[PDB]
């Protein structure tokens, strides 16, 4: 198959600036005056996107921002400028050779001002506590940058087995971060706790983020 | 309006095959090429082959010849992609693909929504879904924030809404978690202070696998 390398493989930018990917191919993608070489974005959740074909042409509603070029063996995907819904994942594509190939695809992100998180904890619902399971929830939303370590204390202790954490593509709004860390216990070691507390570091905050609750 | 419509997600056994569709309209359907596409979780996309329904011609990638296997229907204007000797690396999100003309550079306009393909040992388990009202300790303040935790679930996906889809703004679902063979996963919602309890929430969570739409309503502690 005809090899599509892509670089860089993750790349971030402030808004209005300049974003440049470029993908080169193992082999001429060319072919009568024509560069059978696409570009894809793909956002989260959805199926990719036709973005540019032909190396040089726009998509179907396609903003003039995104603008392909290069041939051969050479191209490079230039946006310009960079707007806060356009936080992606880019792909190169061709379409030469008898099987068709992808590259490894380009992260875009954007740089933005620093933003503090907005904490919040729960204690195990109603519903979960009589069915015999406990867990508490803990939520860090709207945060950068994404860099951000988040730790469970129970009664000053230190908790990390049975801790789930996950974290959210860049908003394509604000171009925040948030995560969310669920710490699930057995109903009789709920009960035998006090205090449960969500504590994060963050930039923002020369001191630990901190958000508890105590039993009793 | 060119629209491709593909069939829901499957959960299949180790060795099985598993048979996806992408019914398409809006064009003249045996006359373009159909591609599918392959993309593992959190892995780029992959090429697998393609199919002219006009005469049944296809293409496959290499790393692909032997275990898919592409048909078209043209009374149905579906076309069919079978996957066989199913392992556990066949697991991924699956996508159908029209192809333009020559002077489009082949390139592949029109999309399906994809269809998630799992294959495991392991059997359906509905979400436990829980809403989580806030604590006494906020006083409310100039928002609130609610949440709703969907836990132990198994396959993926599931779709979360808050009030029916009408309340999006504030809202943050975040990627579903593996853990001991099951799934989890969360949602908040921020809102106004004056919102809530005055205005009902209520999350809804879909598991198409375990065919439940569950609602659990916010309501205070206390």
């Known amino acids: 198959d005809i090899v599509l390398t892509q670089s860089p493989a993750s790349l971030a930018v402030s808004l209005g600036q300049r974003a440049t990917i470029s993908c080169r191919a193992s082999?001429?993608?060319?072919?009568?005056?024509?560069?059978?070489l696409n570009w894809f974005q793909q956002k989260p959740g959805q199926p990719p996107k036709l973005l540019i074909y032909?190396?040089?042409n726009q998509g179907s509603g396609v903003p003039a921002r995104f603008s392909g070029s290069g041939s051969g063996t050479y191209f490079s995907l230039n946006i310009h400028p960079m707007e806060e819904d356009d936080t992606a994942v880019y792909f190169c594509?061709?379409?030469?050779?008898?099987?068709?190939?992808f590259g490894g695809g380009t992260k875009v992100e954007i740089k933005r001002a620093d933003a503090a998180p907005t904490v919040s904890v729960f204690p195990p619902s109603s519903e979960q506590l009589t069915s015999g399971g406990a867990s508490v929830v803990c939520f860090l939303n709207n945060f950068y940058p994404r860099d951000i370590n988040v730790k469970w204390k129970i009664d000053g202790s230190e908790r990390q087995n049975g801790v789930l954490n996950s974290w959210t593509d860049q908003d394509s709004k604000d171009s925040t971060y948030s995560m969310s860390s669920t710490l699930t216990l057995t109903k009789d070691e709920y009960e035998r706790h006090n205090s449960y507390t969500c504590e994060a570091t963050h930039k923002t905050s020369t001191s630990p983020i901190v958000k508890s609750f105590n039993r009793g | 309006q060119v629209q491709l419509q593909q069939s829901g997600p499957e959960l299949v056994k180790l060795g099985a095959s598993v048979r996806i569709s992408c019914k398409a309209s809006?064009?003249?359907?045996?006359?373009?090429?159909m591609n599918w596409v392959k993309q593992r979780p959190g892995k780029g996309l992959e090429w697998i082959g393609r199919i002219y329904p006009g005469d049944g011609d296809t293409k496959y990638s290499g790393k692909f010849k032997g275990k898919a296997t592409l048909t078209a229907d043209k009374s149905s204007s579906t076309v069919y992609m079978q996957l066989s000797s199913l392992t556990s690396e066949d697991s991924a999100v699956y996508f159908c693909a029209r192809s333009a003309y020559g002077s489009e550079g082949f390139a592949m306009d029109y999309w399906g929504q994809g269809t998630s393909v799992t294959v495991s040992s392991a059997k359906t388990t509905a979400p436990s879904v829980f809403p989580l009202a806030p604590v006494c300790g906020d006083t409310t303040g100039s928002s609130v924030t609610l949440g709703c935790l969907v836990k132990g679930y198994f396959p993926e996906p599931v779709t979360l809404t808050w009030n029916s889809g009408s309340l999006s703004s504030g809202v943050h679902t975040f990627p579903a978690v593996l853990q001991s063979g099951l799934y989890t996963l969360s949602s908040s919602v921020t809102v106004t202070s004056s919102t809530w309890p005055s205005q009902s929430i209520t999350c809804n969570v879909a598991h198409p696998a375990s065919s439940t739409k569950v609602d659990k309503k916010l309501v205070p502690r206390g």
């Open positions: 032909a190396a040089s």
């Open positions: 594509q061709q379409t030469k050779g008898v099987s068709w190939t």
């Open positions: 082999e001429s993608v060319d072919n009568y005056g024509i560069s059978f």
């Open positions: 809006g064009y003249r359907f045996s006359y373009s090429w």
